[PDB]
Amino acid sequence: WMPAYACQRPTPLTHHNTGLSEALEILAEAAGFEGSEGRLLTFCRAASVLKALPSPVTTLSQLQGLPHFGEHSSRVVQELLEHGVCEEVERVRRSERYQTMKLFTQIFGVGVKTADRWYREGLRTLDDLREQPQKLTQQQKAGLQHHQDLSTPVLRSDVDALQQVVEEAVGQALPGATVTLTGGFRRGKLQGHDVDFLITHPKEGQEAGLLPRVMCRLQDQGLILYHQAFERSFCIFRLPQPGSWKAVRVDLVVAPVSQFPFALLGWTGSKLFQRELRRFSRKEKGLWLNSHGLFDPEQKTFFQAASEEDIFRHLGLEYLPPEQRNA
DNA sequence: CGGCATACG
DNA sequence: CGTAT
DNA sequence: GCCG
Ligand SMILES: [Mg+2]
Ligand code: NA
Ligand code: NA
Numbered sequence: 001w002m003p004a005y006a007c008q009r010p011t012p013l014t015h016h017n018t019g020l021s022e023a024l025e026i027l028a029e030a031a032g033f034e035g036s037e038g039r040l041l042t043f044c045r046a047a048s049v050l051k052a053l054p055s056p057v058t059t060l061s062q063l064q065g066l067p068h069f070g071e072h073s074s075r076v077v078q079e080l081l082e083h084g085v086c087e088e089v090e091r092v093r094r095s096e097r098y099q100t101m102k103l104f105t106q107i108f109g110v111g112v113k114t115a116d117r118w119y120r121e122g123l124r125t126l127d128d129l130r131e132q133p134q135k136l137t138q139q140q141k142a143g144l145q146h147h148q149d150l151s152t153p154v155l156r157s158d159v160d161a162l163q164q165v166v167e168e169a170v171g172q173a174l175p176g177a178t179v180t181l182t183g184g185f186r187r188g189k190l191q192g193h194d195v196d197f198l199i200t201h202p203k204e205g206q207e208a209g210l211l212p213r214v215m216c217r218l219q220d221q222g223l224i225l226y227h228q229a230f231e232r233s234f235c236i237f238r239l240p241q242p243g244s245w246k247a248v249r250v251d252l253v254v255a256p257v258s259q260f261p262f263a264l265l266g267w268t269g270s271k272l273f274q275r276e277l278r279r280f281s282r283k284e285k286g287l288w289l290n291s292h293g294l295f296d297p298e299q300k301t302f303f304q305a306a307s308e309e310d311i312f313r314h315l316g317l318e319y320l321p322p323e324q325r326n327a
Numbered sequence: 328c329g330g331c332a333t334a335c336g
Numbered sequence: 337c338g339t340a341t
Numbered sequence: 342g343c344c345g
């Protein structure tokens with residue numbers, strides 16, 4: 001009844017097993033902090049299975065036959081159902097390792113490997129990092145300076161304001177170019193921690209060289225607090241607020257229109273949905289999927305897509321709108 | 328037991 | 337190494 | 342950690 005891949009089932013943004021999925025995603029996150037990518041994936045998948053269920057899990061027997069629920073994930077649910085709390089999950093929550101790795105990895109420019117190194121060096125707090133700025137990259141200096149603003153959720157009203165300023169710059173850089181909201185907001189989220197935009201032009205080839213022109217114009221408008229030919233730009237924008245402003249993470253991506261459906265699909269996510277979709281494509285259909293295209297390694301040809309609908313069809317999957325890709 | 332998505336900056 | 341879905 |  002429950003397909004094994006997340007791309008085979010609708011997953012809405014809000015669901016009926018929130019507490020259970022949030023506990024499993026703690027263990028997934030903790031597995032990532034320890035470099036256990038396989039365990040992270042299983043816990044992520046088990047969490048996503050519960051998001052896709054049509055009603056609350058109330059008894060352990062309801063886990064029978066669900067994919068990705070074995071001894072470990074089932075025991076987590078069992079303890080939550082019986083006691084409202086899972087000892088392992090709570091032990092992770094309060095551990096100095098988990099809390100510090102979470103704090104460090106949330107910094108823009110700090111990954112698991114850097115966080116882990118700092119943790120081993122004895123560092124624990126953001127002010128610990130601020131004391132030795134010579135050890136920081138320019139990207140990390142920016143993430144740390146702006147960390148407080150970047151921790152405050154972005155609202156959909158903020159997104160509409162940002163999209164207008166991006167379109168203004170894009171329109172000057174290349175008349176006719178279009179801006180599409182992607183990421184979590186396209187999946188229906190009301191808040192987020194960053195804003196994702198996909199830029200193209202209806203005339204194949206006209207988008208070449210576009211992103212530097214867009215960035216130079218945003219920078220000339222005083223809107224760029226930070227940014228690194230290129231096709232992805234990871235920016236910190238100055239977003240106006242009442243009598244002030246705040247820093248917001250904004251990602252700008254350009255694709256040629258021939259690849260737009262694949263880039264839209266990839267950048268709309270969720271992250272787990274795209275991993276599962278690419279895994280399904282490769283392992284069940286023998287096709288290689290990325291945010292540029294879909295490749296048949298037998299015939300050595302790329303599939304032409306005019307829409308996301310085309311892509312789902314070429315993979316033999318029922319279409320899922322973005323709001324049902326919240327795996 | 329091997330595999331676990333796949334890019335770009 | 338970092339970033340993104 | 343789980344699946345095929
Ligand atoms: Mg996003
Ligand atoms: Na980070
Ligand atoms: Na983003």
